[PDB]
Ligand binder design. Structure first.
Ligand SMILES: Cc1ccn2cnnc2c1NC(=O)[C@@H]1CCOc2ccc(Cl)cc21
Ligand SMILES: Cc1ccn2cnnc2c1NC(=O)[C@@H]1CCOc2ccc(Cl)cc21
Lengths: 304, 304
């Protein structure tokens, strides 16, 4: 027992981190097969970021201007192209450490692990979620761009995020591995409106199921509710509306614990209306929303 | 910016995880050079755990009774010995993936990463701390024994923990890599008294410095205190007493922020006396004590 904000083992992804330098800018790159993926803002200087014309800046760059270093050895760049907000640097050597992989565009509310990197070297790994407003609350300093978000299913790594930016609000924006930003963000140093950061209701309920499984049960009450009644409370508290799809995904957790999804919704409604009253659930004094129902089953069953 | 409960990249340790089976029991092993380290309770059946005589059970075991599998290949066991609560299984092949490493016995209040494993396969990685009562609040299911705790300094892995047990209280006890338990725990299925779980004061102050650095400043007040006055409050709230050694370790964080250690102590005293009043610090509604002053500097500076 015990429940932790657990990340996927990062070994498969560490073997893909490289350093990419173009001019004076250095960021991280992702080497899979003979391609190195990195944010296109690697061609920008600090001045360019205010209003960059990426296509115009790219014309001035050739293959030899992209320095790609994997550990201490230099990779030969034989081609370059810009796909949306990422650069694909074709190299002459396939990464011998390339795991089985996929590129996936995740939905808001989905979780993933981030291997924070600087100069192509890993610093740490943590679990986070794509917020409903398409930002992530990461831990990224200057030089962390190109660090990737991923999930692992047995031996296949599903890369879902590449870090590009920090908004003036301290939150992070990035792209999928095809270079399309999550949300309305652009790779420009300009005022960018992050919308309301709502709580991921289905994840909070999944975490409440994880607490029941691990022994914390004080919040269980004698009440039930309906999806429409629950959603009136959820709206008031800036929670995402719970749908029948969410109830279905919570089916296996409802089955294991013997607590109906709507009964767990009524416990959540009471927790929203009354607060925790100085108590904790799974060592937290707030309702945690960064564990999906799949994460709870995975951690509670020990999937390797 | 942004502050996360970040773990060390787990790649170096994943390359050392093996599966160890003896009779009907299977747990994890740590293969470094030609030795596989694992908990000695691998020789026990569920019945043996109530009152095991390890030396007597070990006599009945020979090298061929320890099945060691690294991925899908079998390792030949050429020797075995019991050192405290761990077994050292000498194999005929040095682990080709052995990183630079050390075995260190950590102090309470020190943090480390855990690579939770089942059947020699990694499931996840999370950061945790050795509690002052010598327990860890992990996420370990049956079969996770032998999973290791470690820290990394550039390229050297310092293994500090090997998981052995879950107390009936849901907390975890284990050993250093020499097989000596942290705390008074024994590898027996018996009632084991975990003492008071105090809060690691120096880590809470380090985390308050991390919050100031990352922009959360509401808790900063107009007050100061003395070490003796602070410690009267710390005692009342089951916090570890702060010493001049702790003040010295917080020196660099005090220097960077310009907030004297005793001034931060007075902010902490007010937070203990008045609570958070429905507010958060670094996304937490409680005072976090699992970041050492070294962790805060490392994360805030991007050490790879
Ligand atoms: C300075 C800094 C600090 C922490 N970071 C955490 N993550 N990235 C940073 C960071 N750098 C940036 O976000 C740069 C600098 C200028 O603004 C933009 C605008 C757009 C894009 Cl794609 C990148 C950037
Ligand atoms: C059953 C279970 C569940 C979650 N775990 C998380 N970690 N280890 C477990 C676990 N198994 C045990 O703790 C065993 C089983 C009997 O009690 C003892 C006593 C002493 C030792 Cl060294 C091991 C064990």
């Amino acid at each position: 027992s015990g429940f932790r904000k657990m990340a996927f083992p990062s070994g498969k992804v560490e073997g893909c981190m490289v350093q990419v330098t173009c001019g004076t800018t250095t960021l991280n790159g992702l080497w899979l097969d003979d391609v190195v993926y990195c944010p296109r803002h690697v061609i920008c200087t600090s001045e360019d970021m205010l209003n960059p014309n990426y296509e115009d800046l790219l014309i001035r760059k050739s293959n030899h201007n992209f320095l790609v270093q994997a550990g201490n050895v230099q990779l030969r760049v034989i081609g370059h192209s810009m796909q949306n907000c990422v650069l694909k640097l074709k190299v002459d050597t396939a990464n011998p450490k390339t795991p089985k992989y996929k590129f996936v565009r995740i939905q808001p509310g989905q979780t993933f692990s981030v291997l924070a990197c600087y100069n192509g070297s890993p610093s740490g790994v943590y679990q986070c979620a794509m917020r409903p407003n398409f930002t992530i609350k990461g831990s990224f300093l200057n030089g962390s761009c190109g660090s990737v978000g991923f999930n692992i299913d047995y031996d296949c790594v599903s890369f879902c995020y590449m870090h590009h930016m920090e908004l003036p609000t301290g939150v992070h924006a990035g792209t999928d591995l095809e270079g399309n930003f999550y949300g309305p963000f652009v790779d420009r140093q300009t005022a960018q409106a992050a919308g309301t950061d709502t709580t991921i209701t289905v994840n909070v309920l999944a975490w409440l199921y994880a607490a029941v499984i691990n022994g914390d049960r004080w919040f269980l009450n004698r009440f039930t509710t309906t999806l429409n009644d629950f959603n009136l409370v959820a709206m008031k508290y800036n929670y995402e509306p719970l749908t029948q799809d969410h109830v279905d995904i919570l089916g296996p957790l409802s089955a294991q614990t013997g607590i109906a999804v709507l009964d767990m919704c009524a416990s959540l409604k009471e927790l929203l209306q009354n607060g925790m009253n100085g108590r904790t659930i799974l060592g937290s004094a707030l309702l945690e929303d960064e564990f999906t129902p799949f994460d709870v089953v995975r951690q509670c069953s020990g999937v390797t």
